[PDB]
């Protein structure tokens, strides 16, 4: 409805990924693990799927947010597959 | 050459529904007592208009001009009065009663002679007279017959009141233009028979009698401008009281229809058989007076049958109608419908071609007879082309792809005599139905041999190709018409059409370029206005309609910083899986 | 959320929240400024003023408002210099008199005539002639300006020799420069010239006043026609933060059409080049009037279109257009017109992604306007659908652009997002996609699914069923035609759109099927719509190329 549209990434000088990193990269391991919790519980209550549809970038922010701070890598491949 | 006889006959051929023309010829074959000829013509007309009462009347009022003889008149009454031609018109039964009058003297014959004239009168009553409201003329001559009757004995004077009462007790229940005056004569007549037991007879009819008036009133309004006047005498047959070919007063028709719809309600609560009888009477009447109004035949035929059996009925009438209106595309189809129904296939082609031919003729007749009027020459061209499209289709459905094409070819040979619709229809059939996209596209180009300069056709032709996305073809045609189309507006449209086509399947480049030529040749055009056109959707100008009318608070922060949902929507690596997985682990 | 946010008596955060949902609602930035000022919070007065400037870099009134603000606290080229620069740069042709006046009034103060002297007063002239050259000689209603310049020269006590001479030099140059252009003072201003010319020479005057006589009348003339066309032209935006009234400002997206056209008419009069100026100068004059045009009807996408397509209709610089169309879209973030005009300039210069971002930008702003109208008066199903359509439409023409630039993949992905939008979009989307998939991508099967798929949320819709039908009946989807028909009779409310469904199928039957099949189905039809008319319905069965010829060529009385 009125969620944040996102940001225009100047493709001519960065990457959306080198940018995802750069944003997550300024939230000390605290907030990092703090956020992840909010995305742990929010999933347990389904309404989540939608907000992950109309924002595939929020998937990557979360997927990098995980693997990064140790969460999987042999299971990651179980997502696509 | 001053042989108006061999003259009028040709004329009568080229326009056989022009009744007056047969009359003109009759009013000659007669002046020269050419009684061997007068009967051939009069019969020719009979064949085409077997149900035009007056015609039959004008045929009897020509024998009643010389005593009579049940040798000449007998055959005729046989014909028209037959069961296959229920000619139930009053102005005729009168001419029949006149006969059953002379050839049946009351004196000479006697008990059984006079008693025969009742039959005549009586039938006309049960068949016609009790349905037609404006039947004053009749009942009178009949009661006048039951009046002048001089009882000769105890049983005759008795049987006299037996009949006279019946007759009264019968017409005084039917909406008639005399219900009142006849009621003034019944009420007084019952008192010359009983001044103690006849004032109760007048007290059993008042019930129905009145209701008969009212309805006659209702009838009277509905009847309004019901002009009913057809020459019954070959002499009053003026070139004015007889209808011209295909001609009919639209208002007239509707009035008639209004009557029939009234007769349907069945306000006289008559039995079904009679109701049906009644209805049939009025329909017949109608069809006679509006004989050239296809709706009246289509409505009656689809009734005569709509009721009873005999699948042969609907077709029977329809055929007669089609006879009065040979170039009628409604009866043509209505007829090739019944035929199709009784699988009488061949009959389907004939009946439709007949229409084709009559139309084909009316054409050559208008053309080599004042080609100056293009306003009524193209309309004809279209009606022809139309009855060819609706035919070509019917054969493609019944016969097979083959003939479907045979007809198209017939047309193609007719050259510019038809309109672009034919190439546009056959292109459709070949394209969506048979799916022969190659010939479908050839049919069209082929129509270029006579319409490459017809803006209208070029537009329609294009619409097609752009819709189906014939890329090349779409272009090839455009590039070879810009010079061929006059009317600036259909040309303005050619560009608009194709610019949009480029905007849709080409490239800003392909467009821009074309847009350049477009503005070059149409400087006056409006840029923003043409711009809105380029961006239509489902053929609607939403750009003007809807805009240029005058023509989990915390995660919702991450969203506020991450790139836009179009840098990754490219391929979501993880789907619904990020649901059945992040909940547990 | 945004405006549905909790707020104390925190009028500062309240307005901001609004300004966040309706950023084009200028007035709201003026409401905030009359506050952050009230509480002398200059650090904010400025943050705001710029957030405003950023979006409307061409609103002369706005800039005026800001200097008219600094002219209330002596002056200091510390604050005022960056502003003048920022607004009078090359990139922003801010050419409005009431601004040049707020500029003269500066080069006036920070440049005393006495103190400095020769070079001083000589500088004030510069700042005076520059307006003449760039603006004034183009603004018919420039009576103000002029008088203040001429008066500035009338009080120029000749200090010596070369001065008393150089004096008339100018006054005349001036006097002539103005007596040509059509202005609201051409008459009065002439009275003074004649007399004045009789205050310096005798042998001259009538010879001088004679050379101008010509251009002067032709001038009064043009000005008259102009005054006609100008008729109901009203130009009264606020120039001082204080005159700012919620009425004399443009509420989001609002613009008086009548007034729009008036501007356009003035412009199409200026293109006729009645004055017959050089080219460079004509282009010059046209441009000034388009700026004024755009400043007062900044929410009319037609003025930014006409102008952006003009600034380029001449010179190269494949950026002029993209640029002005951008600023235009800034005032109308939701104009589909500008969305497309931009998503064109971009494709022109192979800036492909700029396209998509650009078109989505409209969609987003539109999606918002919708959810605004809905959870703001769902009672209004009139406008609530108009908006739904604009949204659905801008999606169509977007899913189309990507099926072309990208391809079937994204053309399809864009459909999905749309389908997910449930009933937020109108049926059109399913229809337009059915087309792409059918006649352009020739994928019959998928095509038919896109259609059926539209039923989940549209099987009650009479309109959408008919349109759906039209398809199948045309491309002859035999069974599928029959299937959808049987499954709709019972679901379509509107009797009329149900009568049509039948009608269509009956015509389909007579066509591809049989008379028996027709007869059968007709029975049904008549059974349900007894009121019907036997011969009429007949004349339809027989339409050709979608025209009822029986009726037109025979049963005409219908």
UniProtKB/Swiss-Prot annotation, chain C:
Keyword 4Fe-4S found: no
Keywords associated with the record: Cytoplasm, mRNA processing, Nucleus, Repeat
Stretches forming HAT repeats: 40-72, 75-109, 119-155, 166-199, 240-272, 281-313
GO terms assigned for molecular function: mRNA binding
Superkingdom per UniProt: Eukaryota
Main localization, broad class: nucleus
GO-annotated biological processes: mRNA 3'-end processing
A GO CC annotation given for this chain: nucleus
Locations listed in the record: Nucleus; Cytoplasm
Free-text function comment from the UniProt entry: Component of the cleavage factor IA (CFIA) complex, which is involved in the endonucleolytic cleavage during polyadenylation-dependent pre-mRNA 3'-end formation.
Protein name, UniProt field: mRNA 3'-end-processing protein RNA14
Organism: Kluyveromyces lactis (strain ATCC 8585 / CBS 2359 / DSM 70799 / NBRC 1267 / NRRL Y-1140 / WM37) (Yeast)
Lineage, highest ranks first: Eukaryota, Fungi, Dikarya, Ascomycota, Saccharomycotina
Gene: RNA14
Residues of the full protein shown: 23 to 582 of 661
